[PDB]
Amino acid sequence: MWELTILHTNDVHSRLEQTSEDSSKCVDASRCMGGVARLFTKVQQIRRAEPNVLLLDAGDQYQGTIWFTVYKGAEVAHFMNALRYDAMALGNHEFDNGVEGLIEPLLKEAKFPILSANIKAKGPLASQISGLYLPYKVLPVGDEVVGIVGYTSKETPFLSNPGTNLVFEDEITALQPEVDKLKTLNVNKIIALGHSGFEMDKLIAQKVRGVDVVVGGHSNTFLYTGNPPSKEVPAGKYPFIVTSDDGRKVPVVQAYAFGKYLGYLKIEFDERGNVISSHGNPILLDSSIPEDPSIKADINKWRIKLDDYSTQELGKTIVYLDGSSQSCRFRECNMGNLICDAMINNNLRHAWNHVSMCILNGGGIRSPIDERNDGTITWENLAAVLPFGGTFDLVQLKGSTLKKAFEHSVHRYGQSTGEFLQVGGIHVVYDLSRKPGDRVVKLDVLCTKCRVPSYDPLKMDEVYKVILPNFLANGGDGFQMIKDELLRHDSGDQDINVVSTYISKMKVIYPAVEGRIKFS
Amino acid sequence: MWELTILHTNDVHSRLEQTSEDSSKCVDASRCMGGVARLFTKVQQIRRAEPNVLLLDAGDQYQGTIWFTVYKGAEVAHFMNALRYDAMALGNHEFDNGVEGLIEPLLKEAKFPILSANIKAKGPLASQISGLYLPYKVLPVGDEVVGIVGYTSKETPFLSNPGTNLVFEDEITALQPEVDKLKTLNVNKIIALGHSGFEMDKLIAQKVRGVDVVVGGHSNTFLYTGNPPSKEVPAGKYPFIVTSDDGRKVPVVQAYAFGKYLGYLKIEFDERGNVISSHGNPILLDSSIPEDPSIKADINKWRIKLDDYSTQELGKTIVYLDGSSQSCRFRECNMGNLICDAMINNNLRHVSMCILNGGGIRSPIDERNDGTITWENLAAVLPFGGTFDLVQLKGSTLKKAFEHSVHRYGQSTGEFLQVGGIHVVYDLSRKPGDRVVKLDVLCTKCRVPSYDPLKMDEVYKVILPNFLANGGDGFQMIKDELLRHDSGDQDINVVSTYISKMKVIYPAVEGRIKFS
Ligand SMILES: O=P(O)(O)COC[C@H]1O[C@@H](n2ncc3c(NC4CCCC4)nc(Cl)nc32)[C@H](O)[C@@H]1O
Ligand SMILES: O=P(O)(O)COC[C@H]1O[C@@H](n2ncc3c(NC4CCCC4)nc(Cl)nc32)[C@H](O)[C@@H]1O
Ligand SMILES: [Ca+2]
Ligand SMILES: [Ca+2]
Ligand SMILES: [Zn+2]
Ligand SMILES: [Zn+2]
Ligand SMILES: [Zn+2]
Ligand SMILES: [Zn+2]
């Protein structure tokens, strides 16, 4: 028997400092969780106790808070080096600043292998990015060797900016030849570390022969064995066991998101590299684990530059602004209503030209905002909600295109995918019992060609003026029908600026869940 | 036979100048209607053509626009004298400024009889007011005499400020002895002119023996025979014929409101004062009738005082603010939503709920004037000078208030509620007191406000006008069952504050009120 402890993080999303338990800015420090200084403490405590330890990242360190807006990846390279990560798989967000935004801040500065077997570079980019990322890495672990094969979501070109000189091959197709190569190199212990979501992770475990453990991200999947330590409801047991097609039991792990937890799985391997047993659970990074003084002091040095921002309050909230994914990707969430009202207000202020409707991919809502901080909302709080630097664009759509967009919003409902829409000037009702593509049972919209605006059934053959983020207007999130069927598209103001000017105009905000979205 | 032409107006409500067709401020003068200068022109044309003419007012000349806010009734006395009205019945709004606000500006200055048979004065007020108003007046009309008996709503002490020295008797009870007295005085032709609403008007016609014609107001009832000239949908034929208990056919007339129409009914009487036939229709006072130059010039002299109010724009509206009664007393109206949002905003800057008697919404606001909203526009919407008060109520009291809101739905009564932070659904097929089928309210004891079914045993913080908080509009359950009542800011100031903060407004009818 040979034992390995896999320590793992995924979807940290610029949460370098300890956060509130919902991962919003830390205010009451005694109840704060996560951060890199606290993570360093737990890792050290496990490394001290266990002989064979790997610390892995399943991607999406990039994009999330003012840490990234300012350091653009340099903070990721620096503090992951400080923590001595053994390997990292590339996430879709690592491409948000293009290949140059990945190469210079992270690929050239990381002292640990960065992996992806399903990303192939072509032509001009190929010679530049040579060995800057790898398909796998064979890591010495004590008297053994462990192979770690990387993978990144197929939909990265539709979620990010990877550019035209990167070919995103199907995960399973690209993984099997890499795993088979490692077997010929007599690497009997194989970890698939990647960023495609829990459903693809279970598929890789099932189909890719020779993979022993799948470590994933992207779906922000919380898995737990027994009674959970916080507010996250588990999606299944930890580890999640997949019975593979070749007749093996393959554990699948994920550690939620935002560095709130440290994934922890102890594996017993046999002489031949097969998993005999696996047990563990994600470790809640709460107050009972102290922040490392050395890392903390270094975080405070790097914080001086973020503090240069105005601590000026854009306004106050008397209600909790629910910007969490388990709300905004599943049902009507008051943060979505606020952003849609900000969108409509911005466009109706300077204007046919009359815009009453708003759509907004819930997945584009990246953080909640707490109201107990005397209700204060600053640019830093807002930048965690809207970090992508997009614009709120004006589009002209047929009712049939909008009916299609709303069918797409729920086409794969239940997987925590980002396409679920938050709305303004629309009253939609879904019936999830119905087959995908026929789930919209009611779709009323606010009339424009009326002196008194009211909700009327959406007409297939009619034309509507919709305010939506540029991401959607450009057919992002699988909304092909918008880019292909739109009749007019006009660029709008910057997303964060639209919301901050609205908050400033309102002074005190109180958005509610009021029935814009219903389920029968 | 002897023919009489009854010309009549009711519920003019300070509409001294010509207005828009919805009775809001006149902007595009070429499409404007009503006003006293135009009314004077039609009256004059009828008077030259017909030998026997009476011009009557069925009350509610008072309260409505900045004309009243400034002139406090003096403008009513002056321009009704100019038009040479033959008689006027007292409306509930004639008491809005108390008895002193009725005595000095109007009663002492009117050159025509002011009537009410069901209002009895007691003690100190009695000796002051003697003969300033009368129960009836016998008017010479050619070689004949016509008796006009007046009446005022029983509900005046609960709608206005008449004071404690005025006893408002039931209309029918007070009318019959007065009509009977006139019969002994050999007055064979009797008109009941009053202000209690169409339903009481039909009742008076039916029960008060000897009344030949009922001229009314208060319900803003539009009656028409044939195809109507404007946007008002008739409530019945003109005149409305009631078969009285003594067997006779009694015509009932009303001329909508705001001086948009002039009521016009020709009556053929027999030598014994019995109506043989009656025919007519309200005359639309549109652009095809010129404003009288003399009255118009005099309106312009009286307008210099109002003009002193700075036309500073509080904000802009990109939508029509529907503040009409046929909307706000029947269903969810975007003006009600705006005022309720202004109410909630004022108090939240935790109170999530708002109720607002639709009858307290007195005018719409047009958006085609480049969207401009001034204090003058707002003063026509909120003319009563009330406050938006904080109240603490049990869910059962609120369920009662919502049952009262629709208890007599269909009569254009003011109690129908406009709401904020409430989602109500009614089923009018159901018996009164059991019409509320859904009542969800915005939670307070929650971090994220959502709509939850109203709990009978729970306590709620509601923002409502002082009028309602003090059990007005028949909302006895509020004054009697409330747990806490706190005075709020002045109604017009709350809304103007809000409009100024929002700059551009766009309220919508969004489903706060539904009908099953
Ligand atoms: O965040 P993970 O990859 O861990 C999982 O969630 C993914 C979801 O987030 C949403 N999303 N993704 C990217 C993206 C975006 N695009 C700019 C331009 C290129 C990158 C940023 N802008 C907006 Cl408005 N929302 C975005 C979207 O709803 C997606 O399904
Ligand atoms: O106007 P008319 O008499 O022709 C017919 O409509 C009557 C309706 O109007 C409403 N109403 N009446 C009076 C009144 C008010 N009271 C102040 C104190 C004393 C006078 C003004 N304040 C408010 Cl918020 N609304 C009021 C109420 O909804 C009533 O049913
Ligand atoms: Ca193996
Ligand atoms: Ca008679
Ligand atoms: Zn992520
Ligand atoms: Zn991702
Ligand atoms: Zn009236
Ligand atoms: Zn009245």
Side-chain angles (χ1 to χ4, degrees):
Chain A
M1 192 271 277
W2 187 82
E3 198 188 57
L4 178 67
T5 296
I6 300 158
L7 299 187
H8 60 102
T9 55
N10 58 275
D11 299 276
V12 169
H13 286 307
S14 315
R15 259 51 165 218
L16 279 98
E17 294 172 281
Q18 61 172 4
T19 61
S20 168
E21 93 112 78
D22 69 0
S23 304
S24 70
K25 195 181 165 64
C26 177
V27 169
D28 164 38
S30 64
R31 288 191 181 96
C32 288
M33 298 176 184
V36 294
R38 175 170 292 120
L39 177 62
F40 180 98
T41 306
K42 201 67 207 208
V43 173
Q44 184 179 73
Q45 187 163 56
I46 290 147
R47 279 169 166 166
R48 283 205 298 210
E50 316 288 350
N52 312 314
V53 179
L54 291 164
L55 171 63
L56 312 170
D57 193 80
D60 272 8
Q61 275 277 340
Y62 270 39
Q63 207 75 263
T65 72
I66 218 99
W67 274 95
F68 187 71
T69 305
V70 167
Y71 289 115
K72 299 164 196 305
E75 80 298 2
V76 172
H78 185 83
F79 289 99
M80 284 186 90
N81 279 350
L83 269 48
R84 291 174 59 120
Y85 269 87
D86 303 282
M88 181 192 177
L90 284 169
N92 54 286
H93 288 279
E94 269 73 60
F95 296 91
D96 287 7
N97 293 336
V99 284
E100 226 62 69
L102 172 57
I103 289 161
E104 296 291 332
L106 183 68
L107 296 189
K108 283 183 178 192
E109 295 300 324
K111 291 163 197 164
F112 52 87
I114 292 165
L115 314 168
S116 203
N118 69 317
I119 313 172
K120 306 281 138 67
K122 71 175 187 237
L125 199 265
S127 33
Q128 301 167 10
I129 210 165
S130 297
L132 299 188
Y133 77 96
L134 288 173
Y136 68 81
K137 190 103 248 298
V138 174
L139 297 180
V141 199
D143 319 65
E144 287 310 308
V145 129
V146 180
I148 299 144
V149 276
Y151 63 91
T152 302
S153 204
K154 277 181 275 198
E155 27 205 276
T156 301
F158 312 103
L159 294 164
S160 200
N161 304 307
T164 46
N165 296 287
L166 286 177
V167 190
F168 281 83
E169 191 175 347
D170 161 59
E171 302 91 326
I172 292 160
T173 302
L175 283 166
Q176 197 69 85
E178 288 311 324
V179 177
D180 289 355
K181 198 165 99 211
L182 287 167
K183 294 298 180 191
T184 63
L185 294 174
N186 291 160
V187 177
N188 55 16
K189 292 173 276 296
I190 297 190
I191 307 166
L193 175 64
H195 201 89
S196 306
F198 186 53
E199 297 308 315
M200 179 56 67
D201 295 349
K202 291 180 288 159
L203 257 160
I204 285 164
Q206 201 204 319
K207 309 274 167 187
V208 188
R209 291 173 308 274
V211 166
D212 302 307
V213 194
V214 184
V215 188
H218 192 72
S219 40
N220 286 14
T221 308
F222 181 64
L223 297 179
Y224 209 80
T225 291
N227 268 259
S230 206
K231 290 189 91 201
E232 298 75 27
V233 178
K237 291 167 208 162
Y238 184 111
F240 185 86
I241 308 295
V242 166
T243 304
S244 59
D245 297 336
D246 62 1
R248 312 168 307 110
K249 293 297 170 173
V250 184
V252 178
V253 296
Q254 211 167 125
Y256 177 52
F258 321 117
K260 184 181 173 162
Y261 297 93
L262 175 60
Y264 173 94
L265 177 76
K266 284 235 260 159
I267 309 255
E268 283 184 9
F269 283 101
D270 63 19
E271 307 122 287
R272 297 202 82 186
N274 308 115
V275 177
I276 284 324
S277 79
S278 56
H279 81 269
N281 254 336
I283 309 156
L284 176 77
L285 265 29
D286 63 9
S287 58
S288 76
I289 311 155
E291 289 189 299
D292 183 73
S294 272
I295 306 283
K296 173 72 183 213
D298 193 32
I299 276 287
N300 293 340
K301 192 177 217 162
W302 281 68
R303 190 49 162 100
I304 306 163
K305 211 170 159 186
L306 305 194
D307 281 330
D308 287 346
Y309 274 77
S310 210
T311 43
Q312 202 178 23
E313 78 150 11
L314 300 153
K316 284 182 184 281
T317 184
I318 50 167
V319 308
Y320 177 74
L321 299 176
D322 190 359
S324 70
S325 81
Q326 34 271 285
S327 276
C328 301
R329 300 182 183 221
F330 286 88
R331 59 197 73 88
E332 179 182 0
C333 69
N334 70 332
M335 181 75 89
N337 290 351
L338 165 65
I339 309 155
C340 262
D341 297 352
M343 255 141 118
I344 288 150
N345 188 280
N346 194 265
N347 220 285
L348 284 184
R349 198 93 141 79
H350 314 282
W352 57 92
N353 287 293
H354 244 116
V355 285
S356 52
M357 298 150 53
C358 171
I359 65 166
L360 173 61
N361 60 299
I365 307 165
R366 307 304 296 196
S367 181
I369 292 167
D370 206 272
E371 79 282 19
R372 299 167 294 159
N373 182 29
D374 217 289
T376 304
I377 308 168
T378 61
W379 183 268
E380 192 192 324
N381 294 125
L382 243 129
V385 183
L386 303 122
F388 303 131
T391 59
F392 293 143
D393 294 1
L394 156 67
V395 85
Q396 226 195 0
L397 299 165
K398 272 163 73 195
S400 54
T401 305
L402 263 150
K403 171 60 159 72
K404 278 167 164 178
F406 273 99
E407 285 297 356
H408 180 72
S409 172
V410 288
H411 87 283
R412 51 179 180 169
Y413 184 102
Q415 260 179 87
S416 207
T417 55
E419 79 265 354
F420 184 90
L421 298 168
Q422 291 307 316
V423 304
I426 297 149
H427 285 163
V428 64
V429 183
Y430 299 116
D431 186 347
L432 308 169
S433 85
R434 306 181 77 91
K435 312 160 272 181
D438 189 62
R439 294 186 161 159
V440 178
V441 291
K442 175 176 278 297
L443 191 51
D444 303 319
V445 294
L446 204 46
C447 65
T448 45
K449 196 213 207 82
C450 50
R451 302 192 59 192
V452 180
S454 84
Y455 288 78
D456 293 298
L458 164 133
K459 285 184 183 179
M460 302 290 275
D461 65 321
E462 202 76 52
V463 178
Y464 304 92
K465 292 163 248 81
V466 189
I467 310 303
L468 39 40
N470 59 331
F471 173 67
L472 294 185
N474 311 111
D477 242 344
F479 288 100
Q480 193 79 333
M481 80 291 288
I482 294 161
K483 188 192 158 196
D484 292 356
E485 299 176 28
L486 58 83
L487 314 157
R488 150 118 113 201
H489 173 224
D490 305 296
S491 290
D493 298 343
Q494 284 278 331
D495 55 18
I496 185 156
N497 295 92
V498 168
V499 185
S500 58
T501 52
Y502 183 79
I503 292 161
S504 299
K505 189 249 262 289
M506 301 306 287
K507 300 188 185 285
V508 173
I509 53 143
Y510 40 87
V513 157
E514 58 208 23
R516 301 188 188 186
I517 304 144
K518 288 173 170 149
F519 290 88
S520 85
Chain B
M1 81 93 215
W2 188 83
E3 198 188 57
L4 176 67
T5 297
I6 301 158
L7 298 187
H8 61 103
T9 54
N10 58 275
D11 300 85
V12 169
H13 285 306
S14 315
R15 259 51 165 216
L16 278 99
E17 294 173 280
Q18 60 172 5
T19 60
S20 167
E21 93 112 78
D22 68 359
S23 305
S24 69
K25 194 182 166 63
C26 176
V27 168
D28 165 36
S30 64
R31 288 191 182 95
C32 288
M33 298 176 184
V36 293
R38 174 169 293 119
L39 176 61
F40 181 83
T41 307
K42 204 74 225 248
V43 172
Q44 184 180 74
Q45 286 193 67
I46 291 147
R47 278 168 165 167
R48 333 185 268 218
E50 315 287 351
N52 312 315
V53 180
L54 293 164
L55 171 62
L56 312 169
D57 193 79
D60 272 9
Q61 275 279 339
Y62 270 38
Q63 206 77 262
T65 72
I66 220 97
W67 273 95
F68 188 71
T69 304
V70 167
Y71 289 115
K72 299 165 193 305
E75 81 296 2
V76 172
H78 185 83
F79 289 99
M80 284 186 90
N81 278 350
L83 268 48
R84 292 180 222 83
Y85 268 86
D86 293 285
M88 181 191 177
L90 285 168
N92 54 286
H93 288 278
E94 270 73 61
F95 296 90
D96 288 7
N97 294 336
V99 284
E100 228 59 71
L102 170 59
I103 293 165
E104 296 291 332
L106 182 68
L107 298 189
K108 282 184 175 191
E109 294 302 325
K111 292 163 197 163
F112 52 84
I114 293 169
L115 315 168
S116 202
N118 58 327
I119 313 172
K120 305 282 137 68
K122 71 175 188 236
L125 200 264
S127 33
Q128 301 167 10
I129 213 145
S130 293
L132 289 182
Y133 79 96
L134 288 171
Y136 68 82
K137 189 103 249 297
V138 173
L139 297 179
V141 199
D143 308 333
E144 287 309 308
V145 129
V146 179
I148 299 142
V149 276
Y151 63 91
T152 302
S153 204
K154 277 182 274 198
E155 307 314 324
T156 302
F158 311 104
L159 293 165
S160 200
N161 306 306
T164 49
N165 297 287
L166 287 177
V167 190
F168 282 83
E169 297 172 320
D170 160 58
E171 302 91 326
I172 293 159
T173 301
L175 284 166
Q176 197 69 87
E178 287 310 324
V179 178
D180 289 355
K181 197 164 100 211
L182 287 167
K183 293 299 180 192
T184 62
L185 294 174
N186 294 157
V187 176
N188 54 15
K189 292 172 278 293
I190 298 190
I191 308 167
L193 174 65
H195 200 89
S196 305
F198 188 52
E199 295 308 314
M200 178 57 65
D201 294 350
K202 291 182 287 157
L203 258 159
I204 286 164
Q206 200 204 318
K207 309 274 167 186
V208 188
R209 291 173 308 273
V211 165
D212 301 307
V213 194
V214 183
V215 188
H218 192 72
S219 40
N220 286 17
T221 308
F222 181 64
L223 297 180
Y224 210 81
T225 291
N227 270 260
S230 205
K231 290 189 91 200
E232 298 74 27
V233 180
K237 290 173 193 178
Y238 183 110
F240 185 86
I241 308 296
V242 166
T243 306
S244 59
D245 295 337
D246 60 2
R248 306 174 303 122
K249 297 292 172 176
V250 184
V252 179
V253 296
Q254 211 166 125
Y256 177 52
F258 321 117
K260 182 183 174 162
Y261 297 96
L262 176 59
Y264 173 94
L265 177 76
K266 285 234 259 159
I267 309 254
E268 285 184 9
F269 283 101
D270 69 1
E271 277 160 77
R272 272 215 173 262
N274 309 119
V275 176
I276 285 324
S277 78
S278 55
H279 82 269
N281 254 336
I283 308 154
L284 178 75
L285 305 171
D286 63 9
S287 57
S288 76
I289 311 156
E291 287 189 298
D292 183 74
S294 270
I295 307 283
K296 172 72 181 212
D298 193 33
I299 276 288
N300 294 340
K301 191 179 177 166
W302 282 68
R303 191 48 163 100
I304 315 158
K305 244 131 151 281
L306 311 182
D307 273 337
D308 295 343
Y309 274 67
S310 273
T311 59
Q312 200 185 4
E313 67 156 68
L314 300 153
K316 284 182 184 282
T317 184
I318 49 166
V319 308
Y320 178 74
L321 299 177
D322 191 357
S324 69
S325 80
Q326 34 270 285
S327 274
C328 301
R329 300 182 184 220
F330 287 88
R331 58 197 74 88
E332 179 182 359
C333 69
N334 71 330
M335 182 76 87
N337 290 352
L338 165 65
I339 310 154
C340 262
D341 297 352
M343 256 142 118
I344 288 150
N345 188 278
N346 194 266
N347 220 284
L348 284 183
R349 206 136 72 114
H350 245 117
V351 284
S352 53
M353 298 150 54
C354 171
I355 65 166
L356 173 61
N357 61 299
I361 307 165
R362 307 304 296 198
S363 181
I365 291 167
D366 206 272
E367 79 282 19
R368 299 166 296 167
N369 182 29
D370 218 289
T372 295
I373 307 168
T374 61
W375 183 269
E376 205 217 310
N377 294 126
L378 243 129
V381 183
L382 303 122
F384 303 130
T387 59
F388 293 143
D389 294 1
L390 156 67
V391 85
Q392 227 187 278
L393 299 164
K394 271 164 72 199
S396 54
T397 305
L398 263 150
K399 170 60 158 72
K400 279 167 164 176
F402 274 99
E403 284 297 356
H404 180 72
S405 172
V406 289
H407 87 283
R408 51 178 181 169
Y409 185 101
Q411 261 179 85
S412 208
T413 55
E415 79 265 354
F416 184 90
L417 299 168
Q418 290 307 316
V419 303
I422 297 149
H423 285 163
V424 65
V425 183
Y426 298 116
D427 186 347
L428 308 167
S429 85
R430 306 181 77 91
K431 312 159 271 185
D434 189 62
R435 295 185 161 159
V436 178
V437 291
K438 176 174 277 295
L439 190 51
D440 303 318
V441 294
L442 204 46
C443 64
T444 45
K445 197 216 212 87
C446 49
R447 302 195 57 195
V448 178
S450 81
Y451 289 79
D452 292 297
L454 164 132
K455 285 185 180 189
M456 303 290 275
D457 65 321
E458 202 76 53
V459 177
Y460 304 94
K461 292 163 247 81
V462 189
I463 310 303
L464 39 41
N466 59 330
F467 174 68
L468 294 185
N470 310 305
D473 242 344
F475 287 100
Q476 192 80 332
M477 81 291 289
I478 294 161
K479 189 192 157 194
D480 291 357
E481 300 176 28
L482 66 85
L483 315 170
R484 194 103 29 175
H485 172 225
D486 305 296
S487 290
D489 299 344
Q490 282 278 331
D491 55 17
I492 185 156
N493 295 92
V494 168
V495 185
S496 57
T497 286
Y498 184 79
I499 292 160
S500 298
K501 189 250 262 285
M502 301 305 287
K503 301 189 185 285
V504 173
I505 52 143
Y506 41 88
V509 158
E510 58 208 25
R512 300 189 188 188
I513 304 144
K514 290 171 167 152
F515 289 92
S516 181

